[PDB]
Amino acid sequence: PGSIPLIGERFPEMEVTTDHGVIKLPDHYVSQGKWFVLFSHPADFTPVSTTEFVSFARRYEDFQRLGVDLIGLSVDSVCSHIKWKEWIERHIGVRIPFPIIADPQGTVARRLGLLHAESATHTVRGVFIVDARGVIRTMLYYPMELGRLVDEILRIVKALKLGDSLKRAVPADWPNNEIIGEGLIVPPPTTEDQARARMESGQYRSLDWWFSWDTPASRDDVEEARRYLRRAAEKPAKLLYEEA
Amino acid sequence: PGSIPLIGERFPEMEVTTDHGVIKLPDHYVSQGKWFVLFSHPADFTPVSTTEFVSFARRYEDFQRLGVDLIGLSVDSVCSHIKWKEWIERHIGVRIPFPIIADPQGTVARRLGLLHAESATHTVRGVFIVDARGVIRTMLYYPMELGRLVDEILRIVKALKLGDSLKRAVPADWPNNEIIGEGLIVPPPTTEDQARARMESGQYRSLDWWFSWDTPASRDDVEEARRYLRRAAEKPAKLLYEEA
Amino acid sequence: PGSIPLIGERFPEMEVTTDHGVIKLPDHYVSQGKWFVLFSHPADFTPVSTTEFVSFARRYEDFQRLGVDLIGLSVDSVCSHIKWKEWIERHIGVRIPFPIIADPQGTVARRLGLLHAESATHTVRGVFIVDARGVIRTMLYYPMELGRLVDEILRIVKALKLGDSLKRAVPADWPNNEIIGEGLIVPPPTTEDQARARMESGQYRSLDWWFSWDTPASRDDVEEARRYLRRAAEKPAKLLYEEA
Amino acid sequence: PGSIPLIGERFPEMEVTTDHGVIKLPDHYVSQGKWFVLFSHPADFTPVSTTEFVSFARRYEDFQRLGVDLIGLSVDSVCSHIKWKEWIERHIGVRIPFPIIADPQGTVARRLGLLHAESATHTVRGVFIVDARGVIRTMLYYPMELGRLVDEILRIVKALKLGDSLKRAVPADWPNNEIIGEGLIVPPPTTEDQARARMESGQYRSLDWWFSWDTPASRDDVEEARRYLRRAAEKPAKLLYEEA
Amino acid sequence: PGSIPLIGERFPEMEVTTDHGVIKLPDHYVSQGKWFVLFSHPADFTPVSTTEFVSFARRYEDFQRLGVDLIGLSVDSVCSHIKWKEWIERHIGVRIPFPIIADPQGTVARRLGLLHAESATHTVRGVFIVDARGVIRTMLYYPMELGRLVDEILRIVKALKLGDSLKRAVPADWPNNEIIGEGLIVPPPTTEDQARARMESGQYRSLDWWFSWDTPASRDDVEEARRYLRRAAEKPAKLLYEEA
Amino acid sequence: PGSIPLIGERFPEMEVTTDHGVIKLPDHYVSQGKWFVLFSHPADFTPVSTTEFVSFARRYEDFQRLGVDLIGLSVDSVCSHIKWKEWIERHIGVRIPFPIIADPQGTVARRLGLLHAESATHTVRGVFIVDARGVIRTMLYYPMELGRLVDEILRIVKALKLGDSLKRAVPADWPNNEIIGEGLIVPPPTTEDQARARMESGQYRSLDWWFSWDTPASRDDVEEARRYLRRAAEKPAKLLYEEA
Amino acid sequence: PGSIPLIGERFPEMEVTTDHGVIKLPDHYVSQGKWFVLFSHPADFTPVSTTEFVSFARRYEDFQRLGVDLIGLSVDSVCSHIKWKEWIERHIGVRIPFPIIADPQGTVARRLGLLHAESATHTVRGVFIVDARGVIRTMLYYPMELGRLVDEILRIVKALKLGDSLKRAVPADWPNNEIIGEGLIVPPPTTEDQARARMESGQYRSLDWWFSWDTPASRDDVEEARRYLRRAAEKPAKLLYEEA
Numbered sequence A, B, C, D, E, F, G: 001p002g003s004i005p006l007i008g009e010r011f012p013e014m015e016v017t018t019d020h021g022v023i024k025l026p027d028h029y030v031s032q033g034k035w036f037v038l039f040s041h042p043a044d045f046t047p048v049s050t051t052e053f054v055s056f057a058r059r060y061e062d063f064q065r066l067g068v069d070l071i072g073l074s075v076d077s078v079c080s081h082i083k084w085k086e087w088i089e090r091h092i093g094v095r096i097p098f099p100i101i102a103d104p105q106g107t108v109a110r111r112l113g114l115l116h117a118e119s120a121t122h123t124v125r126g127v128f129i130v131d132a133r134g135v136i137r138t139m140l141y142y143p144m145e146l147g148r149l150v151d152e153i154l155r156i157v158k159a160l161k162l163g164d165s166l167k168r169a170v171p172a173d174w175p176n177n178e179i180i181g182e183g184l185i186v187p188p189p190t191t192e193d194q195a196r197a198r199m200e201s202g203q204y205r206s207l208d209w210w211f212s213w214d215t216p217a218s219r220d221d222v223e224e225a226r227r228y229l230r231r232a233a234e235k236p237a238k239l240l241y242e243e244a
């Protein structure tokens, strides 16, 4: 069994050695007003890991649009990271522009609970989504044998940033929720007086005093988020292996 | 500042009280050859949680077709669970056919690391995907303010089952991987002799001795996986709040 | 076994979440010059608990006359508390006006020793009677299977406030004591000189130097206390189940 | 700062010295197939305590008829116990037929949590109701300044024996509950399947699937319990101090 | 076994509850320049203990002339103490004028090692002779079955007070020592130089350098002490049980 | 500070070295059906200690009549014991016939609590009265400055053996008790049934059910006990310092 | 085993009770510029111990001439010490002029490791040779059965004082060493340079760079030490038992 930092906590204060140099987490991103997604992979020159790095690199523009930086993590050293990045550029034609943490003694990995029973020595496929205040907002642990759906990582940061700016909770499968579609949920009342006040308001569509929603998201916000999902659902036009 | 069970561990032995009665995890499901998705929600009669239960309930037959059972969890008691289910059936027209664990002293929540800094008293939106051997395969921690993408939970269980069956690793964004499309990855060589023998046998398409793949997934398996992501990407024709 | 606060101790300082808001105990009631009865029930949408909530609600005016506020407690959450109150108002015609604490991790339950061996997860039927100084004056532990006699809780607070205001101890079964009727007892001498001064004085009816009494309670005080017990002994005029 | 034994626990094994001899609790009463009420008082030759011993002795036949015995407890020694009983018989005309525990080192007091903050040295007015299996069923803690309502101890024991024999829970204020009067509650369903089958049985009057009741108590058992509360409510015809 | 305070130690600082009120030991006596005898008995309304209280009461003036107060101790409460004193004055015609400590939790009993193996719950017949500086000078432990010789307690305090004021040690059986009669012992030399100087002074009757004595006690001092032993030896003219 | 063994406990098993040889306590005396008085003195060739050794020696026949052996104790060695015994025989004309324990490391002294605050290195004037079963019956602690009353030690053993043989308790100042003279007390009733049975038989003189006595002692028992006290009270015929 | 103070350590600070009064070691002797020989014996009025005391007493002037005081030690008390000195003066005709420590709880014994397996209760024949700075210079432990050679104790202090004043080491059997006779050894070089600088000087007789000596002791110094050994070797002309 293992130990983790938690949703709602500040990302633990640490210096990390990356292939772009030493950076301090979370302060390096906080000071820039930037969210970051820190993710891990078992080892360099591994095939599922390579496909994830290519997926992330291809979506890099979508992340920069949301004010989100990316940072990778494996127990491999900076030299392996750089040779691996060179290999991907040369054989796949995709430059990886974001840093990768070298975690040789698994100092960062043990702090983030990235070592699971599947490997004593290599991190699983962890994801920490950290907001511009350096707070952990979402944590995912995918295994060695299964690649992530990177479009879901985009949907999560887009939905979270929306939730924060409009003061709303996001329904299941947004923006295609099967009850309220692209509707966003008003935080429910926490007192009986508040409940009564809302159900006399008439200000929101309601199924009950605890279930109110409106549609305050721009058409652009809704279609941006839906575009992530359509990309994930779409059979690719040209497979990159053909031209490699 | 919390501790979780880990991918590759057995789901911890525990007797739990559900609105369907008392069961032993993971035995109850192992003895049936079933996988199970244990997920949690903060409290009954909450709006994001309600949208997630309807979402799971609409996908119930998809889960059942894969041999996956569902079981929810909150700190609310069985009588609340049943009253909440009655409300959903009555007001939304959707029956919740799967059990919900009652965890009032947070005994299960603490074992599974479901209590994060966002609330000392209520569980975040955890997901534990457990195979028919009772082994944790994947763990997701979504926060109070953000509903899950239930189609990604279907893609995860479908891809892991395919990977176990076909002895393959699954590329990022499968079945729409940008490098190899619906291709599955051969576990890479672990020795130099194996590396040489792989590259000499010419038995698979390859970018290097560590990156080989084939297309062994049935057309039905691929299309079922694409169907989950197409549903995720499409706005439903009619929203359930309209006939509510 | 387990642990409890004790008669004569200050109610433990604690912030609690109720369906009326967050309040500090006992400060919230001290600061209003009010006694409070804190009571617990196992779970929302339980029948004995429902009968007790209705009994307390019917007696709300009687507690208000004594400057006593009511606060309930169960491990269920506030949304369950509010839905349960709405069910009682709709189906029995009785509005519950007093707050209910939500104690999902049993934090308040353990502090007040409300978790007995009958249930690891749900509180028994505890009663804490607390005066306007925040001092615990009386504690009752009724089990899952037995509802409380709420008229005895009225008699307890009425007789305690009478004792406080007249400097008197209250005999068994007051105001219908089989020795002295509605009489109240003078605190006995604690020294041989006090015992002699008392037997020389002739100020009180006495059976001995340690058993003196008088009748300093108003007929209003006596008859109000007797009314509580006559209501407990009275077959009700119309059963609330009929009116539904 | 105190530690109590708990409802549902076996009364703790102990040898006690009484003014009737040495006995083992709860074995002495279990062996006779008896329930017992253990109750405490601060000291011999105290006036509220005397009024309570007289109340219990007056009700002794009522306890005996229920298969219930009484045992007292203070920190005073056996010779003081016998002198006090003699004083009560001589001066009030009432024989105390049941034993009193002598607990001079507070060993029994500390085991049962009978030392509260009102007195470091002297027991409050504790009540332990123990069944014929030796299991604690109810616990009451009255203070120094307030006598018990002994008719409520009779109602507690009668209602418990009825609930145990009829497999029913007992409503608030039974047998005068304002919702169902002298009706007794069917323990609610613990599963959705039990809840459907119960609603579909039409076997019982119901307000909901979790609130069902019938009237299986004999007229005699109901009238026995109403008798206790009528005695509590009525001013005695003559007071024992008058003929003293 | 068990522990005790020791000769030469200060009587331990403690607040005690007596039938005359609350007092601090040893300060209450120290502040008056009075010695005290603290003594204990197992329980009120015991026959040997009654004989000893009557013996002490008969000797009260004799103690008073030495500037020695008396204070008793049992584990019974002050109300038992006062009832017992009343019984002695009524039935034996003797008033007990000195306080008795009430020690119901054995707090004082455990501090002074008065709980011996004869009873786990009741003090043996302890005696603590404490001077006006609050220092324990002598300790006696009589058992349950054997009354004290109170005249020996007077001889101890008289002999100690003479030893103190005349700077002398007191021989065996003083004032009727078989070797030197009413003589008192010069404390022996502690050096060879002191030993030679004592023997070269011829100031004292001596049997050796270590055994010197004189007769510095007044005739009044010696006769007071002979009177205590005379009274112990002579049968009383009139037994008190005659006119019961 | 300070620990001791206790009345009612077996004298602690120990081998001691005496000026008569090595002996096991208490087995050496138990084996012969003898009681023993163990007493201590600070040091050999001390004046008060010398007077007490002569007092005990003069009373040796009186101890032997009762079946009681004497054994002394100090921290001085065997050779010093024998040289001190010789000095007493030579200078006072009195043989000391009983053994003295040598306790140079304070092994026996620490076990019996004979090291009080008056001296860290020398034993106070302890007295342990041990019966033929090896049970400690009475313990006295006299200080450095005050010699014992040896006649009181005879009266204690006599009165104890009499209590044991006649199944009686011994009143204060026996056999010159101011209430009942040479009467011995019947151990009081411990139950109400025994108290009633006693007060009915009229078998004894009674002041109450707890205070019964008779006069079962032989005139020899009474007069031998009084003779010890008359000896304590009598001015000696000729002082032993005279013939020296 | 056991535990000692060591050569080169300061003698442990302690206040000891002697037959000359209380003194502080080593301060009492350091403050006078005097060495001291502390020596132990098992018990007073033992024959080997007596012979050793007479041997020291005969050599008292030889010790004084060196500025060496003597002090004995047994577990016996000061009164025994003084009586034993009286016996020696009267029966042997020898005065013991030096103090003896009284150590009845073995406090000093345990500190100086004087309690060996030969006796748990009495010291062996310890010798502590302490210089005028309070430093332990030599330690001898003779057993119960073997008296010391007191002339070797004189030889040790004389040779140490010569070594100290002349900056020399003392050869085996000095002043009759078989290699260098009354020669004293120059402390050897501790470095290569010093070794060379020694052999380059003709300053001293040498067998090697590490074995240099001269004859710096005065004839009187040598003759003093020879006289101690000549006394050791010679049978005394008159044995003290004869004129005793």
Ligand SMILES: CC(=O)c1ccc2ccccc2c1
Pocket (backbone or CB within 6 Å): A077, A078, A079, A080
């Ligand atoms: C090439 C490389 O990754 C690397 C990184 C850190 C090192 C630290 C110490 C020594 C060699 C290293 C090589």
Ligand SMILES: CC(=O)c1ccc2ccccc2c1
Pocket (backbone or CB within 6 Å): B077, B078, B079, B080, C042, C043, C044, C045, C046, C119, C122, C144, D188, D210
């Ligand atoms: C109705 C309900 O949720 C429930 C669940 C568990 C319980 C355990 C003990 C007592 C009452 C309970 C009620």
Ligand SMILES: CC(=O)c1ccc2ccccc2c1
Pocket (backbone or CB within 6 Å): A188, B042, B043, B044, B045, B046, B119, B122, B144, C077, C078, C079, C080
């Ligand atoms: C609706 C409800 O009972 C409730 C109360 C408190 C909560 C705190 C955090 C998250 C959800 C909550 C739901």
Ligand SMILES: CC(=O)c1ccc2ccccc2c1
Pocket (backbone or CB within 6 Å): D077, D078, D079, D080, E042, E043, E044, E046, E119, E122, E144, F188, F189, F190
């Ligand atoms: C009758 C009474 O109070 C009593 C009971 C037991 C005892 C045991 C030992 C000594 C005295 C006792 C007195």
Ligand SMILES: CC(=O)c1ccc2ccccc2c1
Pocket (backbone or CB within 6 Å): C188, C189, C190, D042, D043, D044, D045, D046, D119, D122, D144, E077, E078, E079, E080
């Ligand atoms: C008079 C008496 O024994 C007494 C002493 C202390 C008490 C403390 C609390 C309650 C009653 C008490 C009675």
Ligand SMILES: CC(=O)c1ccc2ccccc2c1
Pocket (backbone or CB within 6 Å): F077, F078, F079, F080, G042, G043, G044, G045, G046, G119, G122, G144
């Ligand atoms: C003479 C004396 O007191 C004595 C007694 C016993 C001993 C045992 C061991 C060593 C010395 C002893 C001296």
Ligand SMILES: CC(=O)c1ccc2ccccc2c1
Pocket (backbone or CB within 6 Å): E188, F042, F043, F044, F045, F046, F119, F122, F144, G077, G078, G079, G080
């Ligand atoms: C006479 C003697 O050696 C001696 C030594 C020390 C003492 C300490 C306390 C009491 C008496 C003592 C006698």
